Each structure stands twice: as structure tokens, then as C-alpha cells.
Amino acid sequence: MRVLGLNGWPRDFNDASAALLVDGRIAAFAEEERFTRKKHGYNTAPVQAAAFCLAQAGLTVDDLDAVAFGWDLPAMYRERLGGWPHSDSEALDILLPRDVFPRRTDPPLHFVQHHLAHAASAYYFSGEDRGAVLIVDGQGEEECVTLAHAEGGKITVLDTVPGAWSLGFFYEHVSEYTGLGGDNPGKLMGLAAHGTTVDETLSAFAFDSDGYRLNLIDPQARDPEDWDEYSVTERAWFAHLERIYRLPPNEFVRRYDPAKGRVVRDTRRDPYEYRDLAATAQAALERAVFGLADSVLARTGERTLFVAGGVGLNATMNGKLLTRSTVDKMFVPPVASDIGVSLGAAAAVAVELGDRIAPMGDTAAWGPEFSPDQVRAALDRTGLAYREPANLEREVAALIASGKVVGWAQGRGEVGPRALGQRSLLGSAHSPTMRDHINLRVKDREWWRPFAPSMLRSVSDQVLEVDADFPYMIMTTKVRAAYAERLPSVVHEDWSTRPQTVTEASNPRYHRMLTELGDLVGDPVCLNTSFNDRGEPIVSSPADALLTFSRLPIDALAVGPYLVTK
Numbered sequence: 001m002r003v004l005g006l007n008g009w010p011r012d013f014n015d016a017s018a019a020l021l022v023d024g025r026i027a028a029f030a031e032e033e034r035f036t037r038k039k040h041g042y043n044t045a046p047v048q049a050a051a052f053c054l055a056q057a058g059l060t061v062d063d064l065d066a067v068a069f070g071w072d073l074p075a076m077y078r079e080r081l082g083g084w085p086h087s088d089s090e091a092l093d094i095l096l097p098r099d100v101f102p103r104r105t106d107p108p109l110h111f112v113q114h115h116l117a118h119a120a121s122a123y124y125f126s127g128e129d130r131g132a133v134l135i136v137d138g139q140g141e142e143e144c145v146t147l148a149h150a151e152g153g154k155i156t157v158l159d160t161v162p163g164a165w166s167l168g169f170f171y172e173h174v175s176e177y178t179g180l181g182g183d184n185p186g187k188l189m190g191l192a193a194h195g196t197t198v199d200e201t202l203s204a205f206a207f208d209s210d211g212y213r214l215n216l217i218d219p220q221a222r223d224p225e226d227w228d229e230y231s232v233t234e235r236a237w238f239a240h241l242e243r244i245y246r247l248p249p250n251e252f253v254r255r256y257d258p259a260k261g262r263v264v265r266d267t268r269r270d271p272y273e274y275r276d277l278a279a280t281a282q283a284a285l286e287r288a289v290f291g292l293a294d295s296v297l298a299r300t301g302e303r304t305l306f307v308a309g310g311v312g313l314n315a316t317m318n319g320k321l322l323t324r325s326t327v328d329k330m331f332v333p334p335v336a337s338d339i340g341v342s343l344g345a346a347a348a349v350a351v352e353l354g355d356r357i358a359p360m361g362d363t364a365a366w367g368p369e370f371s372p373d374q375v376r377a378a379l380d381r382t383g384l385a386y387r388e389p390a391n392l393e394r395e396v397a398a399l400i401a402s403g404k405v406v407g408w409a410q411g412r413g414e415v416g417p418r419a420l421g422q423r424s425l426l427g428s429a430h431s432p433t434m435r436d437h438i439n440l441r442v443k444d445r446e447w448w449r450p451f452a453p454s455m456l457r458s459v460s461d462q463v464l465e466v467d468a469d470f471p472y473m474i475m476t477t478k479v480r481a482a483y484a485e486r487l488p489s490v491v492h493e494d495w496s497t498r499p500q501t502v503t504e505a506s507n508p509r510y511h512r513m514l515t516e517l518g519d520l521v522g523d524p525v526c527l528n529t530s531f532n533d534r535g536e537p538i539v540s541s542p543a544d545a546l547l548t549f550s551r552l553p554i555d556a557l558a559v560g561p562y563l564v565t566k
């Protein structure tokens with residue numbers, strides 16, 4: 001079957017994306033933000049991403065067996081907004097506007113329960129037969145947590161937790177409270193490493209062997225003037241934090257900056273001042289989730305754990321789940337957040353139609369790619385001089401080994417918030433100055449934010465304490481003693497790291513580069529950070545890459561077979 005999965009809607013939505021499954025294989029998958037260049041894909045149908053998906057696979061909407069949306073939108077409208085006003089045809093016109101998606105007739109339209117979509121994005125793509133399912137996000141239509149059993153190609157829900165008790169919303173609110181912003185929870189995770197925890201309950205949570213209770217909020221609380229509990233939980237958490245924490249909310253400041261010639265947004269206080277709150281929030285999240293995970297594993301009799309929902313992006317937490325006595329194996333897809341419910345919805349429907357879903361297979365490279373002619377057009381367009389090295393991978397390795405920072409835009413764009421060797425900025429893993437250089441000089445981002453490494457899978461048994469694939473940088477682990485001091489820009493003082501392991505099959509070019517690098521500096525390991533300007537999405541097109549390259553003080557750009565230098 002050919003099934004197009006979608007997320008994103010014009011009204012109060014984020015993380016628009018589209019994924020196309022053909023006979024159980026991912027033909028194409030991308031996030032709207034990569035095309036619009038507007039981060040988070042807010043308040044939009046995934047128009048560009050779905051257009052890309054069909055173009056990639058050489059299909060039109062008339063070739064689809066089904067279209068799937070990763071929320072029960074009709075139920076949300078009916079229960080929260082006073083009615084669902086759209087026929088399937090009218091809904092399709094919104095999701096897939098006819099001016100971009102000409103169609104003779106309407107494909108079958110399927111709405112999939114949000115947490116089922118999240119669950120399908122983990123289970124069906126994991127390459128594992130069965131396991132316990134833990135979904136933790138902000139909120140679906142109603143619930144913020146789902147515990148389920150994945151087995152026999154089926155997903156059976158065991159229990160849920162109502163939205164008012166959301167761990168996702170909690171974490172967003174803390175992030176907003178600290179001035180990092182609710183839209184940047186990844187930053188809160190990074191800040192947390194710098195703080196100390198005193199009381200992980202925050203005088204709000206109570207923990208037990210199956211999870212948590214939130215005494216702060218009535219679990220059945222429901223906003224009568226909305227379709228999720230975000231505002232209600234925001235009001236509760238902000239009042240509580242101000243009452244118990246020594247610092248009041250950080251505030252955003254909008255002022256005209258003469259040097260930039262525009263009004264810029266800043267924070268009133270340095271968010272670093274809130275590092276203890278960050279640490280404490282991370283600790284509460286971890287403890288809550290440890291209990292939920294232990295509980296679903298025990299109830300299902302499984303030792304393989306699937307995690308999805310946006311809280312599953314918390315690599316620090318994931319690392320600590322992996323080492324628990326109750327967990328033998330773990331799979332978290334790169335698209336654990338809402339961006340993955342397009343894929344998840346497509347999978348649930350495809351499975352229902354009798355297809356067998358193939359494993360993701362250690363790669364997230366499903367977005368657009370560009371031929372040498374296409375890259376050349378973007379280059380020629382700008383009039384910059386460039387080279388076509390006989391051995392580009394060897395040359396890039398040499399640049400990295402010397403301490404230079406290299407833009408790397410190769411093959412199909414990776415999907416999800418982390419660069420994985422398709423759209424990356426690369427630097428030395430071995431350099432004790434590279435971290436400060438990239439934060440302060442290249443990206444001009446917070447000094448306290450860490451970096452993480454890519455390495456050959458073929459060496460990771462020697463480098464990391466665990467011999468397993470870590471394809472997505474979604475899970476922390478620790479290095480072995482021989483590597484405790486060798487890799488200062490990407491390994492913390494406590495030996496922890498957030499790796500990508502790279503197989504030759506997953507990414508021949510990046511694998512070959514890392515191999516060359518290893519010949520130069522002993523270890524086929526590099527620093528791998530997102531290729532973007534601050535606050536902007538990862539670059540997608542050759543023109544995107546050249547633009548950001550032009551803006552940042554980096555040494556070179558390897559784009560397709562071409563090398564541009566500053």
C-alpha cells in the first residue's frame with residue numbers, strides 16, 4: 001500500500017510533517033519547517049513536506065491508498081470546540097490544498113489517536129517483535145501518558161494519565177519560567193547538568209513505584225475555553241514555582257538594538273541563574289518516568305522498552321532508563337515528538353491494510369537530496385569560487401583534524417531535531433577549545449550548551465560502555481576509560497556522552513570521512529552539531545547551506561561533491 005501520513009493543521013498546531021510509506025518502507029519523510037524556514041512548523045498543514053513526499057516517490061494523491069492524520073481531530077473539535085464542521089473532502093482540502101495537490105477523487109482519510117500514532121512510530125520501526133510502550137508528551141486529545149503493550153503487531157493500551165498531570169507541560173513551563181522558553185525544552189535539559197537538586201518533588205510531585213502523583217493540580221482539570229490543558233497547567237505551575245523557588249519568572253525583553261537595527265528579544269535575567277531549578281525539574285521528570293517505565297515493563301512482562309512522545313527527546317533521561325535493572329533493550333525513534341505522528345499514523349493505517357513495516361534501520365535520512373547539477377546551480381547562482389576534490393572525504397577529515405569547522409550537507413536531509421551527518425557542522429572531538437569556539441564564536445549560543453559525537457559503529461564497542469547501535473543521538477551513555485579524556489569537546493567530566501554510531505550502509509560518505517579522520521587522529525570520531533543559524537531550522541537545500549555558511553565564521557562547506565572555503 002501507499003499511505004501518506006500527516007501532522008499539522010492551520011488552527012493552534014505545531015510540528016507539521018508528512019511521511020510516505022510505500023509497502024511498509026519509508027519512501028519520504030520531512031518536517032514542514034525545513035521548507036518554510038520557520039522553526040516548529042506552527043499553524044499550518046504540512047503543505048511543502050507532503051508535496052516533497054509525493055515528488056520524491058513520483059506519486060500524486062490519486063496514487064495513495066490512504067491519507068492518515070496523527071490526531072483524532074474530529075473528536076477534539078466535537079468535544080472541545082462545539083462540533084466538527086468538515087466533511088472528509090473538506091478536511092482533505094485543508095490538509096492537502098487542491099492548488100498544490102490536484103486529485104480526481106478523495107483518498108480514504110483516517111484519523112489516528114494521537115498516542116497510538118506516537119506508539120506506532122516507535123514499535124513498528126524498532127525492528128523488535130514485542131515490548132512495553134511508554135508514551136509521554138504534552139498532551140494528545142486528552143491523555144498525557146499512555147502505557148501499552150506492543151506484541152503480535154498490535155498495540156494494546158493498558159492505562160493513561162489525564163492531561164492536567166502532564167510531565168511534558170510541566171517541563172515546558174519550567175523552561176518558559178527560566179527564560180529558556182517553553183519552545184526550547186532541549187535547552188532546559190542542557191542547563192540541568194549545571195545545577196544541583198535539593199528536593200526533586202518541587203513540593204508538587206509525589207513519587208511511587210508506578211510513576212507519580214501531581215498534588216498541585218486536579219487531574220480532571222479541563223479548560224472549558226480550549227482543546228488542551230496547557231493554559232490551566234501553566235497557571236498552576238507558574239504560581240507554584242514562584243511560591244517555592246527563590247527566583248520569580250524570568251521575563252522576556254523586547255528592545256531596539258542599534259547594532260542590529262531591529263527590535264530583538266532577550267531575557268531579563270541570565271537563565272543560567274536558574275540552573276538549580278533546571279536540575280531539579282530534570283530530576284523530577286526522570287523519577288516520574290522511571291516509575292512509569294518500570295510499571296509498564298512489569299505489567300507487560302517485557303524487557304524491551306519503546307518510548308515516544310516529545311518527552312522521549314530527553315536523551316539524558318533515556319540514558320538513565322537504559323541502565324535500569326528492569327530494561328534490557330530500548331528503542332526511541334528520532335521522531336519521538338509530534339513530528340513523528342505523521343509517520344506513526346501512516347504506519348497504523350498501513351498495518352491495518354495488511355502491510356509489514358520495515359525497521360528504520362539506523363538512519364533518519366528520509367528528507368530531500370540534491371544532485372551535483374542542482375548543487376552547482378545554487379553555487380553558480382552566488383558566483384562564489386569552489387572546488388570538486390578528487391577525495392572530498394579525505395579533505396574534510398584533514399580540515400577537521402586541524403581544528404577547522406566544516407559544514408557538511410550531503411545526501412538526504414535527516415528528519416528530526418538532530419543533525420546526523422546529512423546536514424551537520426563538524427569539528428574536532430579531540431580539541432579542548434572546540435566547544436567554546438563553536439558556542440561563542442561560530443554559533444553565538446549559550447556557553448553552557450554541550451556538543452555530541454558521531455563515530456563509526458565499528459569502533460563504538462571500544463569507545464562506549466555498551467555494544468549497541470545509537471543511531472540518533474537520542475540516548476546518553478558513558479565512554480570507557482581509554483576514552484575518558486581523549487574526547488574533550490564531546491565527552492563530559494563524568495564520562496557521559498550522547499553519541500551517534502554510524503554504519504557504512506547508513507551513510508557511506510560520512511562513514512568514509514570518519515574512517516579517513518580515524519587514520520589522522522587515531523579515533524574515527526568527530527563533533528557533530530546542527531547545521532543552522534541560531535533559532536532557525538537545520539538547513540535543507542544547497543541554497544540554505546550556502547546562506548548559513550555565509551553568515552557563520554566557519555572554515556569550509558562540503559556540499560554534494562563540492563568544497564567551498566572562506
Ligand SMILES: NC(=O)OP(=O)(O)OC[C@H]1O[C@@H](n2cnc3c(N)ncnc32)[C@H](O)[C@@H]1O
Pocket residue numbers: 015136137138139140167168169170171172185186189285309310311312313314315336337338339
Ligand atoms: N503532543 C504534544 O504536546 O507534543 P509532543 O508529543 O511533541 O511533546 C511535546 C512535549 O515534549 C517535551 N519535550 C521536548 N523535548 C524535551 C526534553 N528534551 N526533555 C523533556 N521534555 C521535552 C516538552 O516539554 C513538550 O511538553
Ligand SMILES: [Fe+2]
Pocket residue numbers: 114118137138139140309310337338
Ligand atoms: Fe504528542
